[PDB]
Protein backbone atom coordinates (compact mmCIF):
# COMPACT_ATOMS: atom_id res chain seq x y z
CA UNK A 1 0.00 0.00 0.00
CA UNK A 2 0.90 3.60 0.21
CA UNK A 3 5.01 3.69 1.41
CA UNK A 4 4.67 -0.15 2.22
CA UNK A 5 6.61 -1.86 -0.51
CA UNK A 6 7.56 -5.02 -1.20
CA UNK A 7 10.67 -6.10 -2.51
CA UNK A 8 9.95 -7.05 -5.67
CA UNK A 9 12.03 -9.04 -8.91
CA UNK A 10 14.66 -7.29 -11.22
CA UNK A 11 13.31 -6.61 -14.05
CA UNK A 12 15.83 -4.89 -16.07
CA UNK A 13 16.71 -7.90 -18.53
CA UNK A 14 13.16 -8.76 -19.38
CA UNK A 15 12.64 -7.18 -22.79
CA UNK A 16 15.66 -9.00 -23.78
CA UNK A 17 15.22 -12.73 -21.72
CA UNK A 18 11.21 -12.27 -23.47
CA UNK A 19 13.26 -11.47 -26.56
CA UNK A 20 15.48 -14.34 -26.17
CA UNK A 21 11.72 -16.87 -25.74
CA UNK A 22 10.77 -15.36 -28.69
CA UNK A 23 13.11 -16.35 -31.03
CA UNK A 24 13.06 -19.91 -29.87
CA UNK A 25 9.02 -20.03 -30.21
CA UNK A 26 10.18 -18.44 -34.29
CA UNK A 27 12.86 -20.47 -34.98
CA UNK A 28 10.62 -23.85 -34.01
CA UNK A 29 9.68 -26.46 -36.64
CA UNK A 30 6.47 -26.48 -35.36
CA UNK A 31 6.31 -22.23 -35.53
CA UNK A 32 4.89 -22.31 -39.30
CA UNK A 33 1.14 -21.92 -38.57
CA UNK A 34 1.51 -18.61 -35.90
CA UNK A 35 4.63 -17.09 -37.67
CA UNK A 36 2.36 -14.69 -39.47
CA UNK A 37 -1.30 -13.04 -39.03
CA UNK A 38 -4.36 -15.40 -40.14
CA UNK A 39 -5.39 -13.95 -43.64
CA UNK A 40 -8.81 -12.64 -42.43
CA UNK A 41 -9.92 -12.60 -45.86
CA UNK A 42 -8.92 -16.24 -47.14
CA UNK A 43 -10.23 -17.79 -44.05
CA UNK A 44 -13.58 -18.30 -43.63
CA UNK A 45 -14.57 -17.74 -40.21
CA UNK A 46 -11.57 -16.47 -38.73
CA UNK A 47 -12.80 -12.85 -38.16
CA UNK A 48 -15.70 -14.10 -37.20
CA UNK A 49 -15.44 -16.21 -34.29
CA UNK A 50 -11.70 -15.30 -33.06
CA UNK A 51 -12.27 -11.81 -31.27
CA UNK A 52 -8.07 -11.49 -30.38
CA UNK A 53 -6.10 -12.35 -33.23
CA UNK A 54 -1.96 -13.07 -32.43
CA UNK A 55 0.85 -14.36 -34.28
CA UNK A 56 4.46 -14.37 -33.11
CA UNK A 57 5.22 -11.60 -36.11
CA UNK A 58 3.15 -9.29 -33.91
CA UNK A 59 4.24 -10.02 -30.59
CA UNK A 60 7.72 -9.28 -32.09
CA UNK A 61 6.52 -6.16 -33.53
CA UNK A 62 4.74 -4.87 -30.06
CA UNK A 63 7.78 -6.13 -27.93
CA UNK A 64 10.23 -4.20 -30.90
CA UNK A 65 8.22 -1.05 -29.93
CA UNK A 66 7.48 -1.07 -26.16
CA UNK A 67 4.24 -1.82 -26.17
CA UNK A 68 4.49 -4.06 -23.47
CA UNK A 69 4.22 -2.94 -20.40
CA UNK A 70 5.54 -5.96 -18.61
CA UNK A 71 6.36 -9.66 -18.59
CA UNK A 72 3.23 -10.90 -18.02
CA UNK A 73 1.49 -8.86 -21.00
CA UNK A 74 3.97 -10.65 -23.24
CA UNK A 75 2.88 -13.96 -22.07
CA UNK A 76 -0.61 -13.55 -22.51
CA UNK A 77 0.00 -12.48 -25.53
CA UNK A 78 2.06 -15.72 -26.39
CA UNK A 79 -0.88 -17.01 -24.95
CA UNK A 80 -3.54 -16.14 -26.72
CA UNK A 81 -2.11 -17.69 -29.94
CA UNK A 82 -1.89 -21.23 -28.70
CA UNK A 83 -5.88 -20.18 -27.36
CA UNK A 84 -6.92 -19.04 -30.31
CA UNK A 85 -5.50 -22.20 -32.02
CA UNK A 86 -7.48 -24.75 -30.13
CA UNK A 87 -10.66 -22.61 -30.70
CA UNK A 88 -10.05 -23.04 -34.29
CA UNK A 89 -8.52 -26.21 -34.68
CA UNK A 90 -9.07 -29.78 -34.13
CA UNK A 91 -6.47 -31.09 -31.65
CA UNK A 92 -6.02 -34.59 -34.25
CA UNK A 93 -5.17 -31.87 -37.17
CA UNK A 94 -1.31 -31.12 -38.01
CA UNK A 95 -2.34 -27.35 -36.34
CA UNK A 96 -3.96 -28.34 -33.80
CA UNK A 97 -0.72 -30.46 -32.38
CA UNK A 98 0.89 -27.68 -33.23
CA UNK A 99 -0.05 -25.28 -30.68
CA UNK A 100 -0.24 -28.23 -28.44
CA UNK A 101 3.76 -28.49 -28.72
CA UNK A 102 4.52 -24.73 -29.18
CA UNK A 103 2.15 -23.52 -25.70
CA UNK A 104 4.18 -26.55 -24.06
CA UNK A 105 7.42 -25.41 -25.36
CA UNK A 106 7.00 -21.94 -24.41
CA UNK A 107 5.92 -22.96 -20.86
CA UNK A 108 8.69 -24.75 -20.23
CA UNK A 109 10.83 -21.71 -21.29
CA UNK A 110 8.70 -19.45 -19.18
CA UNK A 111 8.95 -21.27 -15.93
CA UNK A 112 12.91 -22.05 -16.22
CA UNK A 113 14.01 -18.34 -17.45
CA UNK A 114 11.54 -16.50 -14.74
CA UNK A 115 10.22 -18.48 -12.03
CA UNK A 116 13.87 -18.48 -10.85
Avoid at 16 to 39: G, K, Q, R, Y
Avoid at 87 to 95: G, K, R
Amino acid sequence: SMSVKKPKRDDSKDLALCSMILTEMETHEDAWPFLLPVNLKLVPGYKKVIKKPMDFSTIREKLSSGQYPNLETFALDVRLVFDNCETFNEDDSDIGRAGHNMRKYFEKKWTDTFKV
